[PDB]
Amino acid sequence: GGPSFPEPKVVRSQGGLLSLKLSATPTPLAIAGQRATLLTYGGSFPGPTLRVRPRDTVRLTLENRLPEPTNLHWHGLPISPKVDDPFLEIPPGESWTYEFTVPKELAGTFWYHPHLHGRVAPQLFAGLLGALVVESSLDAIPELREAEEHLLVLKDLALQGGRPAPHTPMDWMNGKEGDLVLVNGALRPTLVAQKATLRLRLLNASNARYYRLALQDHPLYLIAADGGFLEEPLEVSELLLAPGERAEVLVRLRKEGRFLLQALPYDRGAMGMMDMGGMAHAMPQGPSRPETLLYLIAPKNPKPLPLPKALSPFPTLPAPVVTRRLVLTEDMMAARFFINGQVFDHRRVDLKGQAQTVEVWEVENQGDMDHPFHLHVHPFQVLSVGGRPFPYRAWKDVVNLKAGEVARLLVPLREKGRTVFHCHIVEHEDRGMMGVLEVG
C-alpha cells in the first residue's frame, strides 16, 4: 500500500514462538537489472527478517542445500555458545535446529550469517545473511510508535558470469568490496516517506566495506548501537558503520525535497598494487569513492515528532576482576593475521575466564588497516579508544579500531562454554585473526 520500498520479508513470532525452517540454497535472482545465482537463506537476498520479543522461543531449522558445509552465527545474541556454536559443521544435505530463548532485557537489531571457519568470506559474500529484530516495550512510547520504521541492510556485491565474483589474492589481504553498493539487495532504491519522523535500523552486513553515513541536509539521532538502546538520543552529523555493526537512528524531515543518503569517502587503510614512480599519494588505495545508497523523499508539509527525552538506562557494571591484552598484527603480503602473535587454532584455548565476573579487555591494533573486533556471546561496554572516552553508553559487540588505536572494553562474562573473538573483516578471520575464549 502506497509507495513500495525494497525490504526483506518479515517472519514474526506467534504466541511466544518463532518456529521456521530455513534452507541455505543457490538461488537465481533478479539483481541490479540482471540475473545472478546467489547463495541465500529462504530464497531471498537479503534473507528474511526474524522479528521477536523478549522471552520468545526461537526454533530455527537450518537446511543445508549448499555444495559445502556451513553453520550459523547468531551475531550479537547473548545466548549459550552451545547453541551459537562456532565449531559446528552442518554437512551438505543435513539440517540442524537452533533453539533458544530471547533474553528478557534485550532490544535492537541483530543478524545471522555463516561462521564455518575458512569459508566465512566466500559464503557471506555470496549472499548468506539476514536480520533479527528484538522488539521492546520502549517501541510503544509515542515518539517511536508514530515514527515510520524501516530496516536498511547495507551489503555490497560484485558479479562475474552471473555468480558472485571469486576472491582474489588482494581480497584475502584487504577484504573484498564490490562495485554494486546495495540497500536491501537493491541498487539505489527510493524511499517515499509517509511520515516526517523515520526510525531506520541500519546493518552493515558487508564483508569489508565501511559506510560513513550522511544524509543530505540532515543530522542523525542515534538511539541504539549494536546490542541495545542508548540512554538518550545522540545527535550526529554522520555515522561510521564498520562491518558487523548495527545502529538505529531517528531522522526528522523538516523540509520537502529529495535527499541523498551517502557513504562518504573513508580510508580504512586498504593497500593497492604496485609498480609506480609518481609524485603524490598512491601505494595505499586511499579513501573510498563516495556512493549514493538511497534517495529519501520527504512527505508533504512535514512536521516531525519531538525526540524522546530518554531511552534505556545502562546497567551499572561491577568492578572488573582481571585485565587482558589482545594485540592485533598483520603480515599483508602473506595475508596472514594474528592475535598476540598467533593464528587461530580450533584445538587451542587462548583465554580462560570465570562466569559471573567482569573483565577489562584492552584490544590494541598494531596493524595499519582498520580492524573491527567482534566478541561472540558476551556483549561489552566500550570504555575508551586511544585513551579518550566513548561517546555513549550502550551494549556493543563490534568495536572498530583504526591503526594504532587501543580500546578498553568492560566484558561481563555470562554463559559458560567455549566461544570465539575475531576481526569482522571476515577475510582476516578466515586468514587467522581469531582466538578462543572458554568461560567456566
Residues that bind Cu ion (CB under 5 A): 75, 244, 371, 423, 425, 428
Is 281 annotated as belonging to a binding site?
yes
Cβ of residue 75: shortest distance to Cu ion, in angstroms? Answer: 3
Is 218 annotated as belonging to a binding site?
no
Q: Which is nearer to Cu ion, 122 or 244 (CB)?
A: 244
Is 378 annotated as belonging to a binding site?
no
Cβ of residue 86: shortest distance to Cu ion, in angstroms? Answer: 10
Q: Which is nearer to Cu ion, 259 or 421 (CB)?
A: 421
Q: Which is nearer to Cu ion, 159 or 425 (CB)?
A: 425
Cβ of residue 175: shortest distance to Cu ion, in angstroms? Answer: 7
* Residue 391 contacts residue 234 (beta carbons within 8 Å): yes
Q: Which is nearer to Cu ion, 371 or 408 (CB)?
A: 371
Select from 420, 330, 428 the least CA-distant residue to 374.
420
260 burial via Cβ count (<10 Å: 0-12, 13-18, 19+): middle
Cis check for the bond before 219: say yes or no (omega within 30 of 0): no
Cβ of residue 59: shortest distance to Cu ion, in angstroms? Answer: 21
Query: Which cell numbers hold the place of 103?
Result: 533474553
Q: Which is nearer to Cu ion, 336 or 414 (CB)?
A: 336
Cβ of residue 370: shortest distance to Cu ion, in angstroms? Answer: 7
Please write down the long-range contacts of 333-340, taking CB distance under 8 Å and 24 or more positions apart.
333/173, 335/169, 335/172, 335/173, 335/427, 335/431, 336/431, 336/432, 337/423, 337/428, 337/429, 337/431, 337/432, 337/433, 338/432, 338/433, 339/421, 339/433, 339/434, 339/435, 340/435
Q: Which is nearer to Cu ion, 77 or 222 (CB)?
A: 77
3-state class of 196 per DSSP? coil
Is 346 annotated as belonging to a binding site?
no
* Residue 165 CB neighbour total at 10 angstroms: 17
CA distance 45 to 38: 8
Cβ of residue 227: shortest distance to Cu ion, in angstroms? Answer: 12
Select from 434, 288, 296, 438 the least CA-distant residue to 374.
434
Which residues make up each annotated binding site for Cu(2+)? Answer: 73, 75, 113, 115, 281, 371, 374, 376, 422-424, 428
Which residues make up each annotated binding site? Answer: 73, 75, 113, 115, 281, 371, 374, 376, 422-424, 428
